[PDB]
């Protein structure tokens, strides 16, 4: 189990750790989060009391270094930083753990929710989508636009998701226009899986990472990327059976975790109705369709 120490909490903030969250008051004796499960990526995220605008946060993996949060009063935010001095990091962590000034990551033992949401997400791929090479952790916020969004404006602060566009020459083989537009298997299996992603695990990792950024930061282009990646599979007549089975599990836990009150902005009626009821894969997502019909029948 690992630990993220906070130097201090000078401004009142709601703090998120993965799917959990808690309120810290202005100048409360808070010094961070302990008992974080090793083995998974994690995200720690913030929403100031005074300004609910800008949710923002850091993706990290504790196996990749010792990280802490320090509030910067010039830039006005909780910043993640790396401590190089290990022995000195152990001393600080040990001192606040003795004084019980840390919240415990509150995982229930029965609970595979975070594993299920992050099964294919890897820090190395996150850092290629979020380009800031001098740090081992990645910063994301509500307002960051995607590469494809900038094509339709600061490139250093963008989300470099894999561009998917159903009416593009990449997607459509000369002389197969109708075949490739109505059945996207060429685009999925040859262009994207074999050519770009290399395997379905990397594909599923980007898809999971886009959903999480949509849900935790309300990031619109992430939401667009998550639906586009679902639609590309649902609209392909030929998909490996193992990929359909895992997709159904993946979306099932995404739909289960989504706040009920955010469904109206995080779910695209057209894509979901198409995917569950009209597409080639309309009968292949048994768990996802059952949870969608019982939780959000309004959308359908």
């Amino acid at each position: 189990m690992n630990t993220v120490p906070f130097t201090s909490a000078p401004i009142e903030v709601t703090i998120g750790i993965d799917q959990y969250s808690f309120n810290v008051k202005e100048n409360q004796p808070f010094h961070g989060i302990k008992d974080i499960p090793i083995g998974h990526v994690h995200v720690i995220h913030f929403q100031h009391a005074d300004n609910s605008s800008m949710r923002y946060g850091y993706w990290f993996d504790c196996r990749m270094g010792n990280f802490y949060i320090q509030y910067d009063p010039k830039d006005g935010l909780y910043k993640m930083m790396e401590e190089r001095d290990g022995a000195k990091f152990e001393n600080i962590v040990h001192n606040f753990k003795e004084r019980q000034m840390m919240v415990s990551y509150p995982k229930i033992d029965e609970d595979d929710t975070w594993y299920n949401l992050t099964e294919f997400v890897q820090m190395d791929k996150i850092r290629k989508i979020v380009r800031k090479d001098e740090n081992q952790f990645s910063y994301v916020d509500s307002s960051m636009t995607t590469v494809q969004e900038n094509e339709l404006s600061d490139p250093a602060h963008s989300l470099n998701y894999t561009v998917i566009n159903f009416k593009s020459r990449e997607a459509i083989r000369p002389g197969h226009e109708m075949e490739d537009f109505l059945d996207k298997s060429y685009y999925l299996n040859t262009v994207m899986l074999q050519g770009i992603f290399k395997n379905s695990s990397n594909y599923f990792g980007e898809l999971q990472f886009a959903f999480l950024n949509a849900m935790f930061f309300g990031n619109y282009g992430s939401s667009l990327q998550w639906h586009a990646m679902i639609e590309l599979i649902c609209s392909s007549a030929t998909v490996p059976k193992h990929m359909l089975d895992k997709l159904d599990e993946i979306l099932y836990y995404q739909i289960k975790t989504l706040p009920e009150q955010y469904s109206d902005i995080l779910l695209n009626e057209r894509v979901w109705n198409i995917c569950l009821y009209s597409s080639f894969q309309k009968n292949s997502l048994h768990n996802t369709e059952k949870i969608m019909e019982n939780k959000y029948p309004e959308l359908l």
């Binding site: 009416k167 593009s168 020459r169 459509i172 226009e177 109708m178 537009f181």
Partner: protein, 237 residues
């Protein structure tokens, strides 16, 4: 964006454009089989591609053999239209290619857009106008070339005959759409109006009769009456 009444004069500016209509590409007759079921038999069709400024009509004839062994023909018909329009554009010299293509039905947008990805500068647009181009098959000489064709074939016409010698393209298009509207609402009455007087002939190289200016005003008046009539007969007014 869409083409409507507000931006109607844009059709007669100097930017090359084409209307594409696909309503006559896939045509069938429905009949009973010996076992009393229903079946369709396809008949020849055509894509109606028109330059509204010049009157040039590129009539691609769709022979029934193109449907042989195919499924979901109404969907294929749209893609076949887009394939043929794309092939036409590519056959034209660059200075002859359109800058816009306006489709008369919104189901053609995606098929045409996908077929034209190589031409990012050509704008593909729908329209809010309810243009009567489906009545092109009521023009006798056009119906005849379609029905006689034994193979795929492109024929070139000028749908304004020589009218541009005497009137602007805005008035020629208004005349054409009034004639086609009439032919669509009541073909028989419309055709009687056009041909009643035997001393007004259709030249061998024309589609319509050789009316004088005064006679075109009379003719145009008679077509309006027909359309208003049928609209009463139809709505009892």
């Amino acid at each position: 964006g869409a083409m409507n009444s507000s931006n109607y004069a844009e059709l007669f500016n100097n930017d090359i454009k084409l209307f594409v209509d696909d309503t006559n590409v896939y045509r069938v007759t429905v009949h009973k089989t010996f076992e009393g079921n229903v079946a369709t038999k396809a008949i020849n069709g055509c894509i109606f591609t028109l330059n509204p400024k010049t009157g040039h009509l590129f009539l691609k004839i769709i022979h029934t053999s193109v449907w042989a062994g195919q499924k979901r023909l109404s969907q294929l018909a749209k893609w076949k239209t887009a394939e043929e329009v794309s092939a036409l554009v590519r056959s034209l010299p660059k200075e002859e290619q359109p800058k816009q293509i306006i489709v008369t039905r919104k189901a053609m947008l995606d098929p045409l857009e996908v077929h034209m990805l190589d031409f990012p500068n050509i704008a593909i647009r729908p329209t809010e106008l309810r243009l009567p181009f489906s009545a092109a098959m009521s023009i006798d000489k056009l119906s005849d070339v379609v029905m006689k064709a034994t193979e795929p074939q492109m024929v070139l016409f000028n749908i304004y005959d020589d009218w541009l010698d005497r009137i602007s393209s805005y008035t020629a298009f208004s005349r054409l759409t009034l004639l086609l509207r009439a032919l669509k609402t009541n073909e028989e009455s419309a055709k009687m109006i056009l041909l009643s007087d035997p001393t007004i002939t259709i030249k061998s190289y024309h589609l319509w009769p050789s009316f004088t200016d005064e006679q075109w005003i009379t003719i145009e008046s008679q077509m309006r009456d027909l359309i208003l009539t049928e609209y009463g007969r139809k709505y009892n007014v």
